[PDB]
Design a protein around this ligand. Sequence first.
Ligand SMILES: Nc1nc2c(ncn2[C@@H]2O[C@H](COP(=O)(O)OP(=O)(O)OP(O)(O)=S)[C@@H](O)[C@H]2O)c(=O)[nH]1
Ligand SMILES: Nc1nc2c(ncn2[C@@H]2O[C@H](COP(=O)(O)OP(=O)(O)OP(O)(O)=S)[C@@H](O)[C@H]2O)c(=O)[nH]1
Ligand SMILES: [Mg+2]
Ligand SMILES: [Mg+2]
Ligand SMILES: [Zn+2]
Ligand SMILES: [Zn+2]
Lengths: 209, 211
Amino acid sequence: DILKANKRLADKNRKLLNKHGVVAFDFMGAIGSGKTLLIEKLIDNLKDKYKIACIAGDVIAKFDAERMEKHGAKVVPLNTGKECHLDAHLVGHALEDLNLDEIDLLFIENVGNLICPADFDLGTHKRIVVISTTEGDDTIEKHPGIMKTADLIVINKIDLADAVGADIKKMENDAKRINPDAEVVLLSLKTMEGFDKVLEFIEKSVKEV
Amino acid sequence: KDILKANKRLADKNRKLLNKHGVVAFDFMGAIGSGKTLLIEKLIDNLKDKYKIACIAGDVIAKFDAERMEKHGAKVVPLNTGKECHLDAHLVGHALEDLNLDEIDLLFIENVGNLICPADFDLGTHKRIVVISTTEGDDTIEKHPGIMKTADLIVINKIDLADAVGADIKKMENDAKRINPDAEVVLLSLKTMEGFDKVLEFIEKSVKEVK
Ligand SMILES: Nc1nc2c(ncn2[C@@H]2O[C@H](COP(=O)(O)OP(=O)(O)OP(O)(O)=S)[C@@H](O)[C@H]2O)c(=O)[nH]1
Ligand SMILES: Nc1nc2c(ncn2[C@@H]2O[C@H](COP(=O)(O)OP(=O)(O)OP(O)(O)=S)[C@@H](O)[C@H]2O)c(=O)[nH]1
Ligand SMILES: [Mg+2]
Ligand SMILES: [Mg+2]
Ligand SMILES: [Zn+2]
Ligand SMILES: [Zn+2]
């Protein structure tokens, strides 16, 4: 079984991160939802207080790895080929290329996709799902599985909602109905509205481990 | 894994069945929310006077898009795709059993929203259309060259929103042409309808060129 084998490696990964005092976050989303830009902003705001590392996973991982690196983060690129999602196996090897005693926060950018990364625990402490208004306001209700795995649901690009005809209150209500336990934040990474709430989720999650 | 060899056999059988009944089929792929359904809706509205049109709508919860296509006057077979990140020829083959192919001229299949998995899975269609949009970012085409190479038409949709996301549409258009020199590349807005003429052109040309 592939799912049993993943959970095994996820717990192993999580055990290793805890040993070295690292708090890890899994950033999932659709394609272009805003994962990298969110991580970029988080690095800029948190790097004074925390030592931050990133794992950037995509077909061509260099695009986002380089985007993260310039913000002052240690970054491990992971070329994911035709895989729909990152897994605890690939993440485990990425952790071997990190000095976890010189790192406090780990931001993992998962492959852009709303089906597959649901079911694949990477060994992180929290999971963030970033969707955007430009995907249409049915995007949350159309993908309940992944939404239920989220600790934070980010509804990004609120500044473009009217232009696509997206109802952001519908999206907010959909997220809360499908996952009552998750935090839900309305965000624009352009205007920065709602960014303080995402930052707060990160900071609290770290202190709660 | 022998998955792709078995799929190809079924895809060829699907194409033969479609050709037998004079149906031209189109596989609509893309990212999440790129505009596949809205494009299909617009195509139905503008071609239904000339062609009898059927759709296959595949997604986790297929009803959302099936219901949209239904109100535009197409016969729709919904496919609830579960955790699968692509449709395949097998499921499409069985969907074809629910259609009267002697009363259909065009088949529009909306694949699941994913730029990775559908690349390797031929559905048994005549043409493949990849819809991406400016709001996903202007690196989207060069970040996923695999699926782009499988496209006969590449649609760069939501051009009306490019400035608001900082996307360079000229860059994206060049990315698409360079990665797939054989594909048609269309800049589109389904809001203003600019570029729609070129999509219709592709559909009609494809129909005329079959076999
Ligand atoms: N207008 C506006 N644009 C945004 C917002 N958030 C992200 N974007 C834009 O969306 C595009 C995609 O953002 P990006 O950060 O690259 O997404 P991503 O999820 O990481 O994309 P991926 O390829 O790895 S799957 C970029 O052009 C970025 O500027 C927002 O809140 N408002
Ligand atoms: N402004 C603008 N909005 C568009 C354009 N094309 C589509 N949209 C909007 O984008 C959103 C997504 O469109 P939709 O047709 O549902 O995408 P889809 O690709 O079929 O989405 P999916 O859930 O099946 S994966 C909708 O809100 C729609 O109104 C466009 O060209 N310009
Ligand atoms: Mg990214
Ligand atoms: Mg759709
Ligand atoms: Zn290994
Ligand atoms: Zn069968």
